[PDB]
Design a protein around this ligand. Structure first.
Ligand SMILES: O=C(O)CCC(=O)NCCCCCCOC(=O)c1[nH]c2cc(Cl)ccc2c1-c1c(-c2ccc(F)cc2)ncn1Cc1ccc(Cl)cc1
Ligand SMILES: O=C(O)CCC(=O)NCCCCCCOC(=O)c1[nH]c2cc(Cl)ccc2c1-c1c(-c2ccc(F)cc2)ncn1Cc1ccc(Cl)cc1
Lengths: 101, 99
């Protein structure tokens, strides 16, 4: 299973095991995820998959994602965001999941 | 899909190309349906291929290790930097056939 690491977020935090809520789980499965429980790295991996495959990044500024009017925009609750602002991105993903025990 | 740059003239990114069979197969493995693409479109599918297979280095995410992968056979290097767009265009241009 794919996973991505960032240098901006503590390791132990990236390794948290989590259970996506239904909308998020549906998004992940739409890009090939098979399971119900993931580390946060694996969640970041499949969301990268999704952004890429729907070409949500802006053609001119490819670090800006326009998620407005898209399921991702629903989940995150913003029209757009920068892929450089990782803590921000973790904050947005968190309300869409439950931590496992 | 489609993607573009700014180290390469935008006109040139729109150039219409016909990948050779191995490169075409690589593109088919990530969902490309056509025989001919814009260079932008080819780049887009190559970026997807690299993302999906995690060819990029874990730490240095702008470095791609293609050694021992079909991508390496095509490109003829074991690694390269995604920031060197001309070098990447050149590698792709060597893997086309004529429409
Ligand atoms: O040329 C330059 O100057 C810059 C080029 C460059 O450095 N490119 C490197 C791209 C590396 C991509 C590695 C894989 O990344 C991911 O899996 C990933 N997952 C994400 C999920 C979200 Cl919600 C947002 C972004 C990404 C993302 C990604 C992306 C990305 C950009 C556009 C796109 F369509 C897909 C992914 N770029 C870097 N990353 C790494 C990353 C990891 C964790 C976090 Cl919290 C944020 C970012
Ligand atoms: O997290 C951070 O702090 C910084 C991260 C960041 O800035 N991310 C930028 C967003 C990534 C953009 C994704 C869309 O890009 C592509 O479609 C693309 N296609 C390629 C084909 C090859 Cl052979 C190599 C790289 C890419 C690539 C890509 C990538 C990339 C990096 C790692 C990866 F696994 C996949 C794509 N990063 C930027 N790009 C843009 C780009 C466009 C044209 C050319 Cl000639 C070179 C690069």
């Amino acid at each position: 299973d794919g996973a991505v690491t960032t240098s901006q977020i503590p390791a132990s935090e990236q390794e948290t095991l989590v259970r996506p809520k239904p909308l998020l789980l549906k998004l992940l499965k739409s890009v090939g995820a098979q399971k119900d429980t993931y580390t946060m790295k694996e969640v970041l991996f499949y969301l990268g998959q999704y952004i890429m495959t729907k070409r949500l990044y802006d053609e001119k500024q490819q670090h800006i994602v326009y998620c407005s009017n898209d399921l991702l925009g629903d989940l995150f609750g913003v029209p757009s965001f920068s892929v450089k602002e990782h803590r921000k991105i973790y904050t947005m993903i968190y309300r869409n999941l439950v931590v496992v025990n």
